[PDB]
């Protein structure tokens, strides 16, 4: 493990791999800490959405996560990756859609070949 | 004015749109008669077509922009910053910076992070606090501030010397109970009052969007407004000098667009079992859920195909997109004649969240706009 970045609202630690794995913990004031497993590859961040409901403060957590992706990582894109066979797939899609994500075409070069998964993308301006 | 241009474009490949601007003018007039106290700010994200935005600009609506791109587009049409609100649920520092540099004042926030970012990049901005609504369609994450959070954010705002001038909320299109508006409005008042105790002079009420774009829905638009108007009169009377706006999206553009797709492949499926013996068809068209039909994935929408070539025995049929992905199913089951590769199919009410992507490389389908003589005269009235 390697300490990557520390802000007033985030703490990231790197796990050893070819493409850099980032464990991103959001620490919002008066809010439960939230750990996201992400991977940095090809100037893009891919965030694993875990099975089950999203924790309290997931919105702000994602806000600071995104800001971290643009500012510190200087990412061109941020990806939402989740298991396609979920009962709440449409809810997730709608949610990140509101957040500004758009549905990624299956087979897109920037998305790994996994037909058992849905991907949404966010592009900075 | 309806299928004439359609047929003309059929007579003399790629899926295309036919859009009626007159229907949009009708929608605007209808909004004027239904909500006379409310100024519509068109949600550009719904359909950012230059012609739509130009039409609505001419008619004199505001614009709910969600990015640098939409702001740049709207401004590039001569629209003053006073008719623009930046209402993205999650903004980045650079976005807000662009808004500050380009004269955009009105901006939303529902969180302390968004607030601190606003204080960071755009001081002297006119903040509109977004409040949550009752989630009975649902979302995986809470949007908008609770009342408690609203109070804390007001105090934090005055603490950061940021000007809070109003309250916004967004019920959404998944609404089945107009009561949701009343409550929200009530809550908005309760936040307005809170502001008065903090020392804020708030005047802007934004009732967001979610208003239906076609009559093919359960809860009609007039049925909603008929409940909205008395709620407004009670909690926000005209004498108070409150400025009331909304952020309608689908309401303006949904029914104005008709999509024409072309059958690119065809399969016959015969189910045999001794003891059904059923012959069904499945057609592949040149558009799908990753193109114009995101609503299939978003809202589990049930689209109905229309024959451009009305007639023939009917067979059980399904319609799929060109991606052959397990989720690219447009119509699960419908009764159709036997069609062929090269035939066209029409889908109405395809104006909202359909067109536009650039990311996928999928070039925007061609759109043909049509305006009748009288509709163009009425267009010439506002301009
Ligand atoms: C998504 C959204 C809308 C959408 O309005 P519709 O009429 O449902 O298309 C409006 N306002 C805001 C702030 C939104 O995020
Ligand atoms: Mg609407």
Query: Do B130 and B108 fall within a single domain?
Result: yes
B377 occurs within a structural domain: no
Chain B residue numbers touching A60 (CB-CB < 8 A): 111-113
CATH code at A50? Answer: 3.40.630.60
Residues B265 and B247 grouped into a single domain: no
* B158 and B43 fall within a common domain: yes
**Alpha helix (H) residue ranges in B160-290:** 179-198, 221-235, 250-253
Among B236, B252, B268, the domain boundary falls at: B252
Residue B290 burial (C-beta neighbours within 10 Å; 0-12, 13-18, 19+): buried
DSSP, collapsed to helix, strand or coil, labels residue A17 as coil
B162 and B227 inside one domain:
yes
Structural domain range at position A113: 1-125
Do B190 and B51 lie in a common domain? yes
Taking the C-alpha atoms of residue B332 and residue B330, their distance in angstroms, rounded to an integer, is 7
In a domain? residue B335? yes
**Residue B242 CA: distances (Å) to CA of B107, B235, B327:** 17, 10, 47
With residue B347 as reference, give the H or E element that holds it: strand B344-347
- In a shared domain, residues B154 and B103: yes
User: How far apart, in whole angstroms, are the C-alpha atoms of residue A102 and residue B69?
Assistant: 15
Pick the last residue of a domain from B252, B275, B299. Answer: B252
CB B175 within 8 A of CB B210: yes
Pocket of ligand 1 from Cβ distances under 6 Å: A 98; B 43, 46, 64, 87, 170, 173, 208-211, 247-251, 352
Provide the experimental method for this PDB entry.
X-ray
Give CA–CA dist A43/A40, Å, rounded: 7
Beta strands B106-109 and B126-130 are parallel
CB atoms within 10 A of CB B353: 23
Of B247, B237, B134, B232, whose CA–CA distance to B185 is shortest? Answer: B232
For chain A, the farthest-separated pair of C-alpha atoms sits apart, in whole angstroms, at 41
Domain identity same for B99 and B222: yes
Nearest-CA neighbor of B160 among B101, B112, B110, B194? B112
Question: Is residue B378 in some structural domain?
Answer: no
Best of B88, B141, B294 to mutate (most A CBs within 10 Å, chain A) = B141
Nearest to B140 among A60, A63, A88 (CB): A88
Interface A:B, Cβ pairs < 8 A: 95
What total of structural domains would you count in chain A?
1
Nearby residues of B266 by Cβ (< 8 Å), 6 or more positions away = B281, B282, B283, B284, B339, B340, B341
How many angstroms from the chain centroid is the CA of residue B3? 25
User: Pick from B252, B270, B299: which residue ends a domain?
Assistant: B252
Q: Which of B346, B296, B351, B273 is CA-nearest to residue B51?
A: B351
**Residue B36 domain boundaries:** 22-252
CB neighbours of B120 closer than 8 A, spacing ≥ 6? B93, B96
Which runs of E-coded beta strand occur in chain A?
2-6, 10-15, 20-26, 34-41, 44-48, 77-83, 102-103, 117-123
Residues B263 and B222 both lie in one domain:
no
User: Could you tell me the resolution of this structure in angstroms?
Assistant: 2.6
- Tell me if B1 is assigned to some domain: no
B324 belongs to the catalytic site? yes
Domain shared by B315 and B340, yes or no: yes
- Do B15 and B28 lie in one domain? The reply is no
- CA atoms of B87 and B70, how far apart (whole Å): 11
**What are all long-range contacts of A111-118, with beta carbons under 8 Å and residues at least 24 apart?**
A111/A79, A115/A84, A115/B325, A115/B326, A116/A83, A116/A84, A116/A85, A117/A81, A117/A82, A117/A83, A117/A84, A118/A80, A118/A81, A118/A82, A118/A83, A118/A84, A118/A89, A118/A92, A118/A93
- Number of domains present in the structure of chain B: 2
- B382 assigned to some structural domain: no
The residue of chain B with its CA nearest to that of A90 is B298
Residues B231 and B345 in one domain: no
């Amino acid at each position: 493990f390697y300490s990557d970045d520390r802000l007033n609202v985030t703490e990231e630690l790197t796990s050893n791999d070819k493409t850099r794995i980032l464990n991103v913990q959001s620490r919002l004031t008066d809010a439960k800490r939230i750990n996201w497993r992400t991977v940095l590859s090809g100037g893009s961040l891919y965030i694993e959405i875990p099975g089950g409901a999203l924790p309290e403060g997931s919105k702000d957590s994602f806000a600071v996560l995104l800001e971290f992706a643009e500012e510190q990582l200087r990412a061109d894109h941020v990806f939402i990756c989740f298991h396609k066979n979920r009962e709440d797939r449409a809810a997730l899609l709608r949610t990140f859609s509101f957040l500004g994500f758009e549905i990624v075409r299956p087979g897109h070069p920037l998305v790994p070949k996994r037909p058992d998964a849905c991907f949404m993308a966010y592009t900075f301006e | 004015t309806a299928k004439d241009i359609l047929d003309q474009k059929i007579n003399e490949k790629d899926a295309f749109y036919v859009a009626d601007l007159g229907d949009i003018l009708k929608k605007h007039l209808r909004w004027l008669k239904a909500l006379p106290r409310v100024t519509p700010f068109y949600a550009v994200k719904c359909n950012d077509s230059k012609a739509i935005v130009k039409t609505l600009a001419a008619t004199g609506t505001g614009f709910d922009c969600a990015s640098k791109t939409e702001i740049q587009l709207v401004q590039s049409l001569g629209v003053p910053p006073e008719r623009i609100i930046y209402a993205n649920p999650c903004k980045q520092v650079s976005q807000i910076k662009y808004a500050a540099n380009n004269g955009v004042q009105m901006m939303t926030f529902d969180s302390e992070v968004e607030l601190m970012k606003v204080a960071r990049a755009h001081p002297k901005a006119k903040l509109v606090l977004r409040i949550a609504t009752d989630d009975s369609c649902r979302l995986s994450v809470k949007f908008g501030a609770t009342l408690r959070t609203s109070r804390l954010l007001l105090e934090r705002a005055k603490e950061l010397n940021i000007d809070v001038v109003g309250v916004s909320f967004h019920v959404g299109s998944g609404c089945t109970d107009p009561e949701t508006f009343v409550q929200a409005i009530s809550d908005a008042r309760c936040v307005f009052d809170m502001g008065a105790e903090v020392g804020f002079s708030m005047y802007l009420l934004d009732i967001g969007g979610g208003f239906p774009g076609s009559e093919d829905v359960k809860l009609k638009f007039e049925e909603i407004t008929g409940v909205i108007n008395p709620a407004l009169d009670k909690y926000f009377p005209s004498d108070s000098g409150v400025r009331i706006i909304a952020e309608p999206g689908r309401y303006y553009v949904a029914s104005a667009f008709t999509l024409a797709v072309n059958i690119i492949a065809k399969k016959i499926v015969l189910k045999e079992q001794t003891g059904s013996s059923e012959q069904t068809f499945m057609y592949y068209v040149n558009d799908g859920v990753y193109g114009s039909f995101n609503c299939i994935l978003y809202d589990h929408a049930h689209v109905k195909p229309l024959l451009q070539k009305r007639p023939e025995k009917y067979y059980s049929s399904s319609i799929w997109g060109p991606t052959c992905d397990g989720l690219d199913r447009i119509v699960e089951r419908c009764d159709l004649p036997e069609m062929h590769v090269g035939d066209w199919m029409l889908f109405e009410n395809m104006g909202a969240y359909t067109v536009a992507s650039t990311f996928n490389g999928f070039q925007r389908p061609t759109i043909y706009y049509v305006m009748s003589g009288p509709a163009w005269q009425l267009m010439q009235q506002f301009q």
